[PDB]
Amino acid sequence: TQGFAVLSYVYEHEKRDLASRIVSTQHHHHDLSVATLHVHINHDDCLEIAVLKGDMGDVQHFADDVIAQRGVRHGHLQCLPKED
Amino acid sequence: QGFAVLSYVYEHEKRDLASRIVSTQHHHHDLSVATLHVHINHDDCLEIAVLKGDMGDVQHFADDVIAQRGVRHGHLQCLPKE
Amino acid sequence: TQGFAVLSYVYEHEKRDLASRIVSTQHHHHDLSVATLHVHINHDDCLEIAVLKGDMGDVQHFADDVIAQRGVRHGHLQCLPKE
Amino acid sequence: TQGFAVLSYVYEHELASRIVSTQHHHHDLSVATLHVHINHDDCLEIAVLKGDMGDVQHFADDVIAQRGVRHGHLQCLPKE
Ligand code: NI
Ligand code: NI
Ligand code: NI
Ligand code: NI
Numbered sequence A: 001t002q003g004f005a006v007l008s009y010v011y012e013h014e015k016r017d018l019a020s021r022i023v024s025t026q027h028h029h030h031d032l033s034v035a036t037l038h039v040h041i042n043h044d045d046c047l048e049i050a051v052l053k054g055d056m057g058d059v060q061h062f063a064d065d066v067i068a069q070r071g072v073r074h075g076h077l078q079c080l081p082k083e084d
Numbered sequence B: 001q002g003f004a005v006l007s008y009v010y011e012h013e014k015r016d017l018a019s020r021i022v023s024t025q026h027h028h029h030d031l032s033v034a035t036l037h038v039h040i041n042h043d044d045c046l047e048i049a050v051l052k053g054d055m056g057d058v059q060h061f062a063d064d065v066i067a068q069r070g071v072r073h074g075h076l077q078c079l080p081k082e
Numbered sequence C: 001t002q003g004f005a006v007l008s009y010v011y012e013h014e015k016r017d018l019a020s021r022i023v024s025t026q027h028h029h030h031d032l033s034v035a036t037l038h039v040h041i042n043h044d045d046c047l048e049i050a051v052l053k054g055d056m057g058d059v060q061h062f063a064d065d066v067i068a069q070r071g072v073r074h075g076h077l078q079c080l081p082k083e
Numbered sequence D: 001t002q003g004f005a006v007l008s009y010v011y012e013h014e015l016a017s018r019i020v021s022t023q024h025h026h027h028d029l030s031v032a033t034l035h036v037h038i039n040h041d042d043c044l045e046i047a048v049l050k051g052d053m054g055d056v057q058h059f060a061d062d063v064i065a066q067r068g069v070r071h072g073h074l075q076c077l078p079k080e
Helices: A016-028 A056-067 B015-027 B055-066 C017-028 C056-067 D016-024 D053-064
Strands: A002-012 A033-040 A045-055 A073-081 B002-011 B032-039 B044-053 B072-080 C002-012 C033-040 C045-055 C073-081 D002-012 D030-037 D042-052 D069-078
Touching (some): A002 A016, A002 C002, A016 B015, A033 B015, A033 C045, A045 C002, A056 A073, A073 C073, B002 B055, B002 D042, B002 D069, B032 D030, B032 D042, B044 B055, B044 D042, B072 D002, B072 D069, C002 C017, C002 C056, C017 D016, C033 D016, C056 C073, D042 D053, D053 D069
Antiparallel strands (some): A002 A045, A033 A045, B032 B044, C002 C073, C033 D030, D030 D042
């Protein structure tokens, strides 16, 4: 199953090791990443929305790795598998 | 007194660089609307930040970002209120 | 209660009194809009992700109105009320 | 040369639908677009493009020269 997905999550930017982790993972799987929207919602917290593209198993595995990191809050995935 | 588009390229593994870029933007989160990030290759990221506020304050904030060691291709488009 | 939300949906850009309606209603409510990301996922379909901010009841009501337009598909609202 | 590019512009939406359709004609050129509804009438959009710099100046023509598009700017980032 190919498709798209929308992955969103909140984190504190001052948690530097977490943040570096999040961007680096996206670069490692940069093939799966289309682009990410970031809102610095307040002094401490960031809301990010990553648009992903690829095989749905791969997209979900990737999303899991992100959402299952201590410090990531409100992790959410919307899967958009290819339509006929 | 307006909007602005701030764009730049940087290496995300440069830990201090990356830290300062996001930290400066959170210090002025009131001047920030939203940022689009594109991972252009394994090392480099492209960000485009839309800014809003007093043009003096927005320029000074954009300068603070652009002036950081390792920020490349920095560009500011000012859009003062019409 | 106040907060943020992520409203996403898919639409055909050619069926576009629809696209005009979708941008126009966001402008009528631009106080709720932060910014919107668009990805042209294929030649016919557009994925939009609208970040919203405000009262969560107004955000819900706004989002329901967007999603109820015929031709908006995959309408999805993720609410992030203030913690 | 290949690379990326940033195309920004302002327009009155009440146009939005043809600019979108115009980018779909080139959707292989498009990465994603950020849009901010800056006031009741006007939209700010920033399109990130990727591909051949000549297709990119091409894309950026079918938008920037259109009537009603203001504040257009193209930044090309040829691969380093
Ligand atoms: Ni942030
Ligand atoms: Ni990146
Ligand atoms: Ni589109
Ligand atoms: Ni708009």
